[PDB]
Amino acid sequence: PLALDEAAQDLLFREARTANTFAPTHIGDEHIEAIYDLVKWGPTSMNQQPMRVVLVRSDESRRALLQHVLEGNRDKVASAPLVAVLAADLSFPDTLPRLFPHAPNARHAYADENARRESAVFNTALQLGYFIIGIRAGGLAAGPIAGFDPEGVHKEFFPGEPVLVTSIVNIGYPGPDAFSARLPRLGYREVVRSV
Amino acid sequence: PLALDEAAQDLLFREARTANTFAPTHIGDEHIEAIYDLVKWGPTSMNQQPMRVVLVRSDESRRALLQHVLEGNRDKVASAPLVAVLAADLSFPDTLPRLFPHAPNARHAYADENARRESAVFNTALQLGYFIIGIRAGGLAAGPIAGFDPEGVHKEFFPGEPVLVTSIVNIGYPGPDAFSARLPRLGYREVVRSV
Numbered sequence: 001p002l003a004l005d006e007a008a009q010d011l012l013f014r015e016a017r018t019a020n021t022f023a024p025t026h027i028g029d030e031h032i033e034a035i036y037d038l039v040k041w042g043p044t045s046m047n048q049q050p051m052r053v054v055l056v057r058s059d060e061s062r063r064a065l066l067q068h069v070l071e072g073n074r075d076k077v078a079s080a081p082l083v084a085v086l087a088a089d090l091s092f093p094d095t096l097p098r099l100f101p102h103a104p105n106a107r108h109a110y111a112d113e114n115a116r117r118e119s120a121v122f123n124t125a126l127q128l129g130y131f132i133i134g135i136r137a138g139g140l141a142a143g144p145i146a147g148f149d150p151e152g153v154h155k156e157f158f159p160g161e162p163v164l165v166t167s168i169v170n171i172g173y174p175g176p177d178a179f180s181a182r183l184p185r186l187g188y189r190e191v192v193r194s195v
Numbered sequence: 196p197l198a199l200d201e202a203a204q205d206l207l208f209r210e211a212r213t214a215n216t217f218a219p220t221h222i223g224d225e226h227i228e229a230i231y232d233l234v235k236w237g238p239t240s241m242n243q244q245p246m247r248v249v250l251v252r253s254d255e256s257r258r259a260l261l262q263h264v265l266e267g268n269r270d271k272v273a274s275a276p277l278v279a280v281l282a283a284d285l286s287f288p289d290t291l292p293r294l295f296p297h298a299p300n301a302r303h304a305y306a307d308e309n310a311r312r313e314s315a316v317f318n319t320a321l322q323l324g325y326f327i328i329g330i331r332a333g334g335l336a337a338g339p340i341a342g343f344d345p346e347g348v349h350k351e352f353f354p355g356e357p358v359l360v361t362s363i364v365n366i367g368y369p370g371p372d373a374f375s376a377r378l379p380r381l382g383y384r385e386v387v388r389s390v
């Protein structure tokens with residue numbers, strides 16, 4: 001009962017895997033633009049789209065990033081031809097007059113700092129979900145990484161900005177032995193119930 | 196430079212919209228099963244997949260849900276043939292010996308309650324993004340809802356369970372006048388930069 005055809009199902013989900021090694025082949029800016037142009041449409045609360053991205057391309061910036069990556073993740077991050085650092089824009093409310101223009105008081109739903117931060121991180125995580133699918137849609141492999149120090153990455157790449165660094169995503173064509181055996185997924189009956 | 200074909204791009208993102216009205220047509224359990232079977236493969240940190248789902252299908256449960264939904268969202272939530280309530284399993288570390296078996300001490304990364312809650316919510320948000328794409332992959336329309344009282348919903352549908360209710364998703368075939376004009380999206384140059 002799926003409308004999405006099987007080949008698309010395989011590319012995005014069924015045969016898509018997290019890459020642990022990458023080919024060094026350069027990933028072009030035009031490639032990432034095409035991915036963003038596709039998945040920017042994925043919905044966020046009040047269209048608030050708080051995700052901001054820094055493409056850590058140069059060896060210089062990659063070495064600066066690696067000092068904040070846990071040792072067990074440095075192999076992958078160092079070998080990826082492209083690394084995306086995602087941060088949640090804590091000033092997203094200021095964009096709502098133009099992004100959610102028919103509710104002019106929308107920004108004020110987030111006057112509380114905790115509510116603003118929690119909404120920024122939640123919708124940036126939502127967008128990370130879209131982004132992972134978008135990377136796969138671009139024929140590439142995604143290797144998300146949470147084992148890093150967000151404060152150091154903030155100082156390094158977003159100094160003085162009102163953001164919350166949330167994620168690192170290795171992007172590239174897979175290298176040799178990039179994939180380990182698929183791990184378990186919970187059964188439907190363990191996850192879903194009806195009332 | 197997208198490997199995903201154009202028809203799939205349109206179904207999942209480019210021509211997919213958030214539905215504000217729904218046809219009453221019943222959505223069967225097998226339909227949701229096919230959707231979960233597809234998007235359960237979407238990756239989460241340490242394979243921790245904390246999303247848990249209650250399908251609020253019956254009128255009885257829907258009325259109980261609606262008391263916790265903000266006035267301005269009751270119209271949508273009441274008319275959807277199916278509503279999914281998403282919660283983050285705060286006890287997900289207990290499942291890691293099984294789900295992330297090659298790292299037996301993984302669960303101790305979440306000894307701290309805030310670290311555990313933040314991880315549960317972040318990865319449930321990731322899974323919500325996959326789930327939205329999956330609902331569209333199933334030929335349906337998704338209508339996510341954040342304007343509700345999470346504690347009230349927890350008491351109704353997850354009483355005494357160690358979860359954090361995070362999101363409501365209206366699911367169905369779209370009704371008449373389900374969609375308004377697409378809103379703006381930030382430019383690539385506003386979201387992404389390189390170093």
Ligand SMILES: Cc1cc2nc3c(=O)[nH]c(=O)nc-3n(C[C@H](O)[C@H](O)[C@H](O)COP(=O)(O)O)c2cc1C
Pocket residue numbers: 041042043044045046047211212213214268338339340341342343362377378
């Ligand atoms: C996490 C999330 C929460 C949302 N909560 C509400 C809500 O409470 N009320 C509402 O009317 N729409 C809600 N929406 C719908 C968004 O406003 C909508 O998806 C966004 O404006 C983009 O619209 P589009 O998908 O048609 O392009 C929510 C969307 C998301 C992603």
Ligand SMILES: Cc1cc2nc3c(=O)[nH]c(=O)nc-3n(C[C@H](O)[C@H](O)[C@H](O)COP(=O)(O)O)c2cc1C
Pocket residue numbers: 016017018019073143144145146147148182183236237238239240241242
């Ligand atoms: C948010 C997130 C953070 C992750 N962080 C790490 C990490 O720090 N180190 C690592 O080796 N893998 C990391 N991963 C990869 C996950 O372990 C992996 O995606 C999961 O085990 C599923 O693998 P699969 O896509 O091949 O099925 C992360 C994945 C996600 C989604």
